[PDB]
Subunit: 233 residues, 6 copies
């Protein structure tokens, strides 16, 4: 009964899948969950609880940007007793080690945000996922025959960047792609002693310019969705 | 077209109202516009285009956070040729000079974000509205008998602050309230040579802990809405 | 009596016009103030009191630099009870939107100084003028037929800049000119709850390299001086 | 050959063991490798090469602090084409989740150094290990019967800290212990496309002041030396 | 014929004595210079070229603050070909190793300014005097029976400081007193390959609260002024 | 006793010479020190006490880099009552005013470390040596007819720099050469009221790429060593 989530308390299962687009959340709930109840809908930010192979599973939209993401993650932990957080979303590749439709497992989320220096003594916080969840992700991907790409992402405050000249430097330092949430998700989960991991699917390549099409965007990612559901059942 | 707005070119009027919650954006369309047409709905982030007193105006959601807000404003300006941006919203009061239901005109937006240092040579960018818009708001507010509070606001990356011990110092420096997007809106409008202004209603006082009833929030801000629409007439 | 001001409490009228050059302050007193009297002269930094159209007005020199200006404005406020500080000065144009002899009203003052981060929790202080004062300026200029240019200025710790390559970028962000005090005046006034406004005329254009001949610097600043005095009367 | 290593081309095996103390490296060579030979000794910083159950394996000292480590790691990768770097060492525990003789696998190395900001555009470099190396660490440990403690370390430029009051925040954010090299090891190997992992055993507990005996500080690490040798054979 | 000096190229001798207060500069020429001529007077900032006991020499006022001081010494070096700059002034003592009226030689100038980071790639520039002058100072003062105190000063952007709680720590780090110009002077001299040195007299003691009398602040400084004038061989 | 030093309290004299390389510390003991005894040897970091021309004297090695140096210097003062610390070593020249084998006295040490910002309120700490020590150095150096080069040094966290393009700038600002400890030793000494001074011999020129033979390495530095011992008597 927070300001951004109106679900009743208890309505969230201790395992939540996270994605930035509430319409993508509705799609997951309506295609992969059995008896999926919409439990929260403040600001059109939809959240659901259902079953996946008889296992109780929650979904929640988090919007775009570290600040938006931090709002919903914080409330899910502190009020709705969510213990494991699994985020999926797109990203723009910057590394030749990956290409369109690769699924990336963020074992680190660098950032141009000041948020973590505010959290952390104005020093460098290495925002990382929970290693247990990363182990389940790997084993689940190996099981499903998914070639999981593993490395850092860069979480930026900007979709339209003013440092495109820096993408090669980032790529060199093992940053496979750029998105806008992971470094906040990982900090919030570290702060509040929760388990979290981020997975993202290349939809665009910012160096090689390859960019998919509007409806490979709607089907290329069921692979990642299934991976996340499988590693929670 | 744009990854976050699926409106056709020219579906937006040159004057556009902004609010973080697409449901408030929706409320405003139904209650205050004539001949309103939904024009975009990507990621459930609704946008409309109607008429107020026969004059055509647009509305658009922008999410929570500088990062989110920067995405929508950028696209509104560069692609949909929006020229004037009136952002309304709510805020948490920190100054004794304002109370609940007060309307604040932000003539500066301080921030704990790094976005402006990145935009601006790692220096201090004084994020400010367009003066003419702020002159028109003050004139419009007198026309409507509205008592306009003018000062700075502080735009935080944190809804759940880790620096509540700092609120007195901010108010001492004429920060009336905290919100989370104005500094990005102002810097983006400055970047792209567009006219922006931010108004926000005190829904919560962070020092006296007074808060509006849910009934009040939902309808105590119509006067801000009318103010916004009247200065677009 | 302070370590930098020779006067007694009472010699300063509550409305004080400010200029960097003490000989320019003397020039204004001897030309525009009836019953011009000198009230302070520590470090050759001249201050005056007198009357303009029947209104008693004070004038004070603040030197060059944020740190210098900050000393005199802190003392005028804290010891000598000055309430309205109307700073005038010259400035180096960087925008194509202004030329020589234009008067700029600084509705924001960016800076490369660290002083505001030292004042304001290492975050971004958006240093701004009093909105009532700036409204008065605009109204007074329209009454007097003075075309007033409005935007941000950049207040630097450097007269001889090590970063001239950045001038185009500052101009892109609605920084019309560069001077060296407005960010300190605004922030000192914010800190101490006073009303401040900076105006400055273009004596040099840093881009086109246009400049004012040392004599046309004597007189073309009169319309700015009259504007300042007309809004204090 | 480099200014700090006088080993000859190809003297190192592609897999190298790292320890800050050269005399402990000599201990590892003496006690665990057949056919061991001393390949470098500049500044008395010893490197060895030998075999462990038939597999070629090198050892290298790297001194204390991010800067000293960075020197040796860089030269190992760029002049002796080391591929896999497995650092062992000691740390001071700041977490209640770990006690003396616990072995920590560093999924992330936060820091108060500026080196990573110098490397990485002044942003936040999330310094991390090669995931497969860490997965091999988890697998070997499970097979060897060793309970691996897993989480962030904080790599500091200060052995004698000036911010001990902040250790509790560091633990809150899942920093199990403090040492002085991991952040440089991880960033250097990210820079130069090498595979690196850092393990460290808890020799002291900075919160409960518990410490290990001078004999335990010779013998207790053998479980950690064996874990590392085993994941390289 | 700089913007801030109206002397003609030539009127400055290679050795120039600097004070913040030009009325103090006139006091110097009056009480110590034969043949003394006022050579510049822009902005009431007075430069004198006299002779000291037969030796030609120059005096110049630099104002208050690093920015002001930087304008003046840059123009002296770059246009008036000054080669040796020995600045005197007052300072606020902060260390118990000094008392009222001590003369301090600043072999180091720390600061809270951002100017040196702007000069020096955002790194820590160590602002220091020419060593040939600091030794000349030691030798002249030992000849003269002057007991010279030697250490670091803190040049601050703030006369009215916001960080008095830090005076102890600065003191612990051998900062004997606080002033506002030394770091800008040394840095400027360092940039332009000129010899500079700063002496400053304990007029006030910010710990004990002791202070000179109106009279001691006119006459006491003669010793430090004599030390300066002798050393300009 | 300390975690890094083996001597018992007393073995160390109050004047200690320091080199980064323990084989050079041993080389100095053997060649110049009478009645030399090895007092500490932890991690192969050697320390000695002997008599030079009558007076007792100590030597200590301190590894490479600020963090390592700081550990050893702190322990020498705080536990072993060392009061006079004389560091020697090598550097890479970047200034044309110095050539190979030149002996440089550092009057200040700039740095790209964050260590001093951490120590000193996030401001610029101007790291400097004891002026007395530097006086004996210049006096002794002139007695011995050793020609002493005096200027600033740049202490880096990177032996392999990512900013070689900046070398000209550093030299313009009177940084004669580059090393990796001076700023750290000066700040530790400043922190703990000890006397410190750094000399460094030019063994490589990073601009003209000139270098010294490995035989010159063993032998050329003998003037700088004697200079040290002649000023500790
Ligand atoms: N260059 C980029 N390319 C593709 N996807 C993203 C994203 C992801 O998609 C969203 C932007 O539309 C955002 O929430 C983030 O998760 N950020 N930046 C991106
Ligand atoms: N303490 C606070 N109280 C009321 N409203 C806000 C807001 C505004 O409301 C949104 C968060 O609910 C956010 O986008 C901002 O504009 N931020 N912080 C707030
Ligand atoms: N490029 C420039 N051109 C004209 N005036 C100024 C100024 C103003 O003039 C003073 C220095 O000339 C300074 O205090 C500021 O008010 N700064 N930079 C300037
Ligand atoms: N409180 C602490 N306790 C135990 N070990 C360390 C270390 C580790 O041990 C070395 C310090 O002697 C250093 O190189 C690092 O690897 N740093 N800080 C420590
Ligand atoms: N607390 C203090 N006490 C005495 N003198 C000074 C000064 C010196 O006096 C000048 C103005 O106060 C200034 O520029 C510096 O030279 N700064 N701070 C001071
Ligand atoms: N380019 C450079 N050239 C020669 N010596 C050094 C040094 C010095 O030598 C050591 C690096 O080998 C280090 O301790 C420092 O004192 N740092 N950087 C150097």
């Amino acid at each position: 009964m927070t300001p951004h989530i109106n679900a009743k308390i208890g309505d969230f299962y201790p395992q939540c899948l996270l994605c930035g687009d509430p319409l993508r959340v509705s799609y997951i709930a309506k295609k992969f969950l059995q008896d999926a109840k919409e439990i929260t809908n403040v600001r059109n930010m939809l959240g659901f609880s259902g079953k996946y192979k008889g296992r109780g599973i929650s979904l929640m939209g988090h919007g775009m940007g570290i600040a938006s993401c931090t709002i919903y993650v914080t409330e899910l932990i502190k009020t709705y007793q969510v213990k494991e957080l699994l985020r999926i979303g797109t990203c723009g590749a910057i590394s030749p080690k990956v290409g369109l439709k690769d699924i990336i497992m963020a074992t680190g989320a660098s950032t141009d945000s000041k948020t973590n220096r505010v959290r952390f003594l104005n020093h460098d916080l290495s925002a990382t996922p929970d290693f247990e969840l990363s182990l389940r992700a790997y084993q689940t991907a190996k099981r499903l025959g998914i070639d999981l790409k593993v490395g850092n992402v860069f979480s930026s405050d900007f979709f339209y960047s003013f440092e495109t000249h820096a993408f090669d430097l980032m790529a060199k330092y093992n940053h496979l792609a750029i998105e806008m949430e992971a470094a906040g998700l990982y900090a919030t989960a570290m702060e509040l002693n929760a388990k979290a991991l981020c997975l993202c699917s290349v939809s665009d390549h910012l160096i090689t310019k390859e960019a998919l099409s509007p409806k490979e965007r709607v089907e290329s990612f069921d692979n990642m969705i299934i991976l996340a559901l499988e590693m929670m059942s």
